[PDB]
Symmetry: D3
Subunit: 210 residues, 6 copies
């Protein structure tokens, strides 16, 4: 069957889990003990030689890298559950529009957002002091990025068009984490972003991985 | 027709240009004067609100972000010139394998490679001193990455399988730059990588953008 | 009764838990949801205005800061379970010797060790890439620190003298995490350090918090 | 007799010197020539293997690490001069309160304050340019920390209660340095902090080390 | 004859080219292919062992380092074209005044200005994201520096006195680059600076290298 | 007369003091960075960038150490040691000296000063960063190899005579000699050069 080799707290792992749930699919979440360094030793390195979670299995097919896995799910299980591709899924122009947003989340949003979530949650869990200077710097960054998102969301219900797609889905785990932190201010202060956040984080598949 | 709004030295712009040439397509390269800050002002911000090159046009369709653009080219002009997708282009498993590698270039290769190319070439052009410490740090990184590439290339002719694909194409511009620098050692000292580099950089479409 | 307001993965929280277990004390571990930003909001800020875990309660007495809490435990519940102070607990010279080591763990060991554990474990769990350069830098640091520990442990069974004390206890949570990482090499390669690590990590109270 | 092995400009050394003076004790200040790298060679490494000042001697007893030394002084010479412990010195609850504050100075105050003092004073002495960006970053930090101090000092005359203690003493050397810098603004602009600074820096023992 | 071994985009190379043009001299600009790492290999290392552009030749005389080369030009070809030294060129007091300004450009202006120009232009050309935080930090710096320039220019037509000298010349290439960036605001907002910029950048020799 | 407004521990201030001593000149060393004097008036009227040293020779008001040493070298040329080239008006030979001066400022000083600071000045007040030390030592090593090659062809950096080019290195080198970085200075012709210039009476006075 389908197996996800990861960790339930992992943003990348959650990104995959949401897509599976969105597709009403049954799978086994095989826990990788990162705490014991399992990810940096065999046999996990045979599933992903870069030693990051998640790795993935669908029968004989062996994948890693979360965005590639969500895409695979979106296509292989297209007719099942929520459509994660564009309504007209074979339309090349419309796919490109979606692809740009996917690309934007990876390059503009994730690095900043993940740094924020890490400085202000994960640090605190393990026992290091949050760097207020870093937080401020990255908040200023994310603010400028979210202004671009606001403009985009003023012209379309979701980022790739009129429907919820992979483009939106990929943001969810990081946003979830940032909503338990003062950085929520940036999402809330922007009307169309705030509505978008609220719609995508309130989805049942999104709540299943919290 | 087709317009590319970018700069001929730009890695991301070159990534798009190679794909166009590989597809034997005719296009106009519209030069964006980054030197005069054109990219950070209208009307370029209407083509890409994040203010990076390249932006792209195919008739009425307006894109940005290089990897999204190359994918669009690969699909919209699939029949034409070199096949940039997998031989069996509609096969979902085989697409996923390609998608992983595309993902790997973006996350594991590009950040390190670009930093190297920048510290060693672009700094020198302008007049800043190369940081020998940074170079060494990143070379150690890229080495570990390229070992994973060696292992992969021992099992397959190219990164996504038996054929040259987008996965390989996306590496070219950065590699081109690094070949004029002592970092070439890392590519040469690895047999299957060295052959792979040599095959992809010697392609006519790759040379047209040097 | 006794309540610990923290998180079970937290190094500082574990430091307190071990001292409680070592004293055979009964307590409630009240989970603080850092993931929902509980620590940076009231009413937790009334228990610790710097918004870090753990906070602590012993009836009416409200404390924070792990080393202060372990000291309090060591004194208030002195006659009970393991002695965490020096054998001659009222001896001022012997206390000072212990105090130096406590001070050393805080200043020389913890910052480096925690950075290591964070770069290698906690980063991987959330989905950020380990910085191999940082790991190397800090491993070189810890090595130099652990050489000083080796010399010290060659003259005494434990760090403060012939008995296990707070000085040793405070190191445990960080060491536990580092034992599931290639940084174990540094502890193992040093004979008396390795014996010391093995003795303190194998204690029942130490294992209860793993 | 009593020897302090250090340097008169050293914050950590001054911390010890103030405690000795506060206790009306006689001692020899043995100057360590850090300029000639004395601290990183024998025989100083036999007094402190981590090669930092100050080291300390009280007859046969050999100590290092300033906070451990001040605590030792506070206890060994308890009935002499100023009481540096709590009025009810054997009270375990009241000690813990003091211990928290000691812990807070070390973790929250000292790293920021010392960076400030270093960027603004020590850099200028030797001939490096002050980084205005760093100054600003750290001033923002210290401000937030000092707000917590303000709140605390609104409820108590000194940090550990109604009396001057080690908790307060340990702040003095760093504060002295910062008072000759625009960072004084942060101390002055906060009423109860300003009163506290003025009281502790005006003490005769505090002036003796300026 | 005279040869300049450099690159036309290089600030340091331009600094030399302007001085040559200002002196109406004929020379060959020999292009060093930094892109192919020519600067870090022989035979260029025989012209400058630190591997930076520009190197320089005047018959048998072999020089490197731009400010030394411009000085050499200013003296060796003193009676030709524009006077780049002070009107009373042998006056030791007046030379010292010029020398201070030359020193000021190197230490106070260039490092900041070059970072700005690099973060905003050169990064964008090659494909890295501008760090807005860095930009802001350095803009604050340059502003303070330019206030000192404003005060100076209120008392004198140019930086070294009543005439255009090397002191002014050396600023040109960096200023040229910054004029195509929002950092122009800092120059425009200061009256005497703005006039100075406008005069020196509008000189025919300055325009020849744009 | 001549005043130097600085601090005796300051590298830049020492650079000026050595040049004055080398020229057998009499001056007053006017001393408080500790009380933030450098960042307030009236010092800002002597140097608006708020760094030491500032300098006075009668009515003439200077700042910036390399500019001051050059001024000394020229205004008091016939007095004491010659700090310019033997043929002081020769434009080719001046340029050779100027390159070296430029090299010290750009290639040597930033690295050397970071080293001296991480290893000495930090310790006087903060923990030395062993990683930084190593990074910068690798840098300085490469720089000093270039110096070795240069010193193999000439007695001093600008030619056959001791000049400003050499002088400007002294204060930083002095500090680095009390530190394990001395090891790097393992380079024969560099070692001899360091020994000659640091043993000079004017060098020892500061
Ligand atoms: C696709 C065409 S234009 C576009 C976007 C334009 N602004 C965006 C912000 C977030 C995600 C996507 C966009 N995406
Ligand atoms: C697709 C399935 S496994 C895999 C790879 C496994 N190692 C790789 C290195 C570079 C690019 C791709 C890979 N790619
Ligand atoms: C107490 C007196 S001397 C001393 C130490 C001397 N070296 C140490 C290394 C780790 C912990 C403690 C020490 N501790
Ligand atoms: C002890 C119980 S609560 C507490 C503090 C609560 N806020 C503080 C700020 C500086 C030093 C100590 C404190 N100290
Ligand atoms: C020479 C004596 S004071 C002085 C300057 C005082 N402020 C300046 C700013 C830019 C260039 C030179 C100066 N130059
Ligand atoms: C002048 C022509 S070549 C040259 C140098 C060539 N290498 C150097 C190292 C330190 C100082 C000067 C030089 N200086």
């Amino acid at each position: 069957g389908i197996k996800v080799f990861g960790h339930p707290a992992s943003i990348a792992t959650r990104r995959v889990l949401i897509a599976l749930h969105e597709k009403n699919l049954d799978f086994e979440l095989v826990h990788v003990e990162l705490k014991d360094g399992e990810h940096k030793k065999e046999p996990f390195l045979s599933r992903n030689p870069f030693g990051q979670v998640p790795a993935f299995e669908d029968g004989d097919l062996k994948l890693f890298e979360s965005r590639a896995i969500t895409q695979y799910i979106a296509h292989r299980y297209e007719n099942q559950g929520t459509n994660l591709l564009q309504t007209d899924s074979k339309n090349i122009s419309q796919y490109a529009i979606m692809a740009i947003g996917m690309q934007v989340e990876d390059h503009q949003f994730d690095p900043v957002a993940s740094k924020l979530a890490f400085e202000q949650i994960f640090k605190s869990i393990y026992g290091l002091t949050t760097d207020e200077a870093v937080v401020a710097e990255e908040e200023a960054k994310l603010a400028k990025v979210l202004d671009v998102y606001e403009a985009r969301l003023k012209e379309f219900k979701y980022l790739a068009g009129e429907t919820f797609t992979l483009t939106d889905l990929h943001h969810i785990p990081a946003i979830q984490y940032l909503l338990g932190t003062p950085t929520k201010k940036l999402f809330t202060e922007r009307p169309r972003v705030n509505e978008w956040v609220a719609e995508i984080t309130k989805r049942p598949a999104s709540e299943k991985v919290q």
